[PDB]
Structure 1
Amino acid sequence: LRNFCVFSSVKPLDFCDQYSSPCSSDATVDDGWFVCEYHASRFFKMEKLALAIPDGTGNNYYRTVGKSLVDDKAEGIERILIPSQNNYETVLNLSLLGPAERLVFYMIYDNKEKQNEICQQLRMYERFRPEVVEELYNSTLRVLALTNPDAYCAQTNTNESRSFGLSVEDDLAFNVLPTFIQNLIRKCVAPESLTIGTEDLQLRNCNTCRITSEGLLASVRLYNSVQPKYLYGVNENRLQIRNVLQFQGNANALQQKLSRYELYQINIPLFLGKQIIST
């Protein structure tokens, strides 16, 4: 597939796709997220990070992890990274989104009546472009089937096991998430303790997120101040005012002489659960 992004087929009527930041080449490769960096940052409010695991030789067991983009000052529906069926309409703000985005999200969450009424309202557009709708639906449905744990092929790797907490509520809630949402969640949060073969590698002793009935949240108020490089960039006649935290400083307080050491950026990777890798 040249485009593994689910939101790759998101087009207006006369489509020079919105893409203020063009979709990254990550959609071309099969890393398993099935979403490009731009769509991940815009919708799920997370970026992609290459988790490197050294072993003392030079080669690193590379992995994909989610990088939080929400700030510690946030509260409410803004702190949720990935919503569940309960309130995803309000979280993703599907009311004013483009009809292709609405369709894609609704049939990812699989609520029949919503895409039914989308088709009813899209019938008027259908007389101009009667071919894009079917191919868009086919591509998105086949992507969902590929990421679906149960299908015809149903490619299953029981050797990898993911635990999202020692409590019953956490995994019982995680069970009812959509198949694509489950696949994205399992492969965006790094394990707390990667159990590989007959040993355990303690990647992190603290969780940077939480899985609950409404989905994946940045529950901990870890301080984050990274700016998204693939911002929406649309002309904002609708103003969103925010409480920015800024400090002053001189050349002495801004210690440039400390810059020679390799930098340890304050990023917020998603760490939760245990990864059981037999053998």
Structure 2
Amino acid sequence: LRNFCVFSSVKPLDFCDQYSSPCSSDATVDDGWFVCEYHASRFFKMEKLALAIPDGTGNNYYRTVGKSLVDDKAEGIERILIPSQNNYETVLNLSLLGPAERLVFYMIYDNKEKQNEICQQLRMYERFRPEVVEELYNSTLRVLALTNPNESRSFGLSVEDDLAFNVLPTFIQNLIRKCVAPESLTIGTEDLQLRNCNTCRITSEGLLASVRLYNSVQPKYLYGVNENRLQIRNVLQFQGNANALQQKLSRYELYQINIPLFLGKQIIST
């Protein structure tokens, strides 16, 4: 598979003489997410980060961790990172999306009736090109197949967290497992406390950025804005020169104020 993104198979059904998928350059690497950084940012509101664990000899074990794009001012469903099967249609706005993306989302969340309804309603597009549904269905199925199943992963000390996790679809479970790093990682015979505090939570509505931590990240795929419209809203600004703002302190190494997803514990077998 040259492109591992589950949304890479989405194409204009009407006419595709020359179309390029919007997947980013990371869609060609098998990091286990099966979602490119562009699509993850667009849908699940997160980016990818690499976490390196050293051993003592000079070898590094690498892991993926999600970086939350949710600001501290977001409320309600705006703080939901990955929606669950109970509210994915409302959170992702499936009615507004195109039929191909809607079918892909239905197949991801395992809605057989919706899958059949969309497939039967999409047959009239066969009159344009004879692979409107066949190749899309096959590609999505072969992408989802790779997600099917002494390392252990716990997502909280409470039973309700485990119940919320085990009712999610297999693709969603794999995405959450790959995007959420453990607070404490037991590797070999030693425990590494990556963080003593959590930043995300798993509930009946999916994976949410429950903690309202301050986020100062600049998205590299969601930075578009309409300059033609006039926006009138109060903000706060600083008065002073470099002495008052202490601009010289910028010469030091900057501490990034971001929100990586940390929750639960992980056991890595020998």
Conserved? CA contact 1:208–1:269, under 8 Å: yes
Moved more, 74-83 or 114-123: 114-123
How far 1:129 moved relative to its partner? Answer: 1.7
Structure 1 residues 169 and 17: CA distance shift in structure 2, 3 A: farther
The partner residue of 1:249 within 232, 240, 247 is: 240
List runs of 5+ in structure 2 lacking aligned partners: none
Give me the whole-angstrom Cα distance separating, in 1, the residues matched to 2:237 and 2:112: 47
| Range with bigger deviation, 53-62 or 195-204 | 53-62
Structure 1 moving runs of 4+ over 2 Å = 13-22, 52-61, 232-256
The alpha-carbon deviation at position 240 of structure 1 amounts to 10
Q: Would you say the 8 A contact 1:21–1:38 is kept in 2?
A: no
Pairs within 5 Å for 1:1-279: 1-13=1-13, 22-54=22-54, 59-149=59-149, 159-231=150-222, 233=224, 250-279=241-270
Moved more, 21-30 or 61-70: 21-30
Indicate the percent of aligned positions where both proteins have the same amino acid: 100
Q: Which runs of 5+ in 1 are unaligned?
A: 150-158
- Measured against aligned partners, the alpha-carbon deviations of 1:92-137 in whole angstroms (never above 9, x if no partner) come to 1111112111110011111122222322332222211221320110
Query: Cα gap change, 1:58/1:133 in structure 2, threshold over 3 Å: closer, same or farther?
Result: same
Q: Distance in 2 between matches of 1:237 and 1:116?
A: 43
Contact preservation (8 Å) 1:20, 1:233:
no
Structure 1 residues 102 and 244: alpha-carbon distance in aligned structure 2, compared to 1, 3 A threshold: farther
Q: Which moved more, 1:119-128 or 1:181-190?
A: 119-128
- 3-state secondary structure, aligned to 2:135: helix
Distance in 1 separating the partners of 2:45 and 2:17: 20
CA deviations on 1:149-202 (whole Å, 9 max, x unpaired) are 2xxxxxxxxx22110011111011100100000001011111110100111000
How far is 1:12 from its partner? 1.6
Cα distance per residue 1:24-63 (max 9 Å; x no partner): 2222111100000000000000000011234566543221
Report the CA distance shift for 1:181/1:64 in structure 2 as closer, same or farther (over 3 A): same
| CA contact 1:208–1:220 (8 Å) conserved in 2 | yes
Superposed CA RMSD: 3.0
TM norm structure 2: 0.90
Q: Indicate conservation of the 8 Å contact 1:71/1:224, yes or no.
A: yes
> In 2 relative to 1, CA 260–238 (structure 1 residues): closer, same or farther, beyond 3 Å?
closer
Counterpart of 1:172 in 2: which secondary structure?
helix
Residues 83 and 123 (structure 1 numbering): CA distance in 2 closer, same or farther, change over 3 Å?
Answer: same
Question: Distance between the aligned counterparts of 1:218 and 1:76, measured in 2?
Answer: 10
1:209–1:270 CA contact under 8 A, matched in 2: yes
Task: Provide, for residues 208-250 of structure 1, a one-character-per-residue CA deviation record: whole Å limited to 9, x for no partner.
Answer: 0001111100000011121211128497999999986665554
Relative to structure 1, the CA distance from residue 251 to residue 180 in structure 2 (aligned partners, 3 Å threshold; closer, same or farther) is same
TM-score by length of 1: 0.87
Report the CA distance between 1:142 and its aligned residue. Answer: 1.2
Q: Number of aligned residue pairs: give it.
A: 270
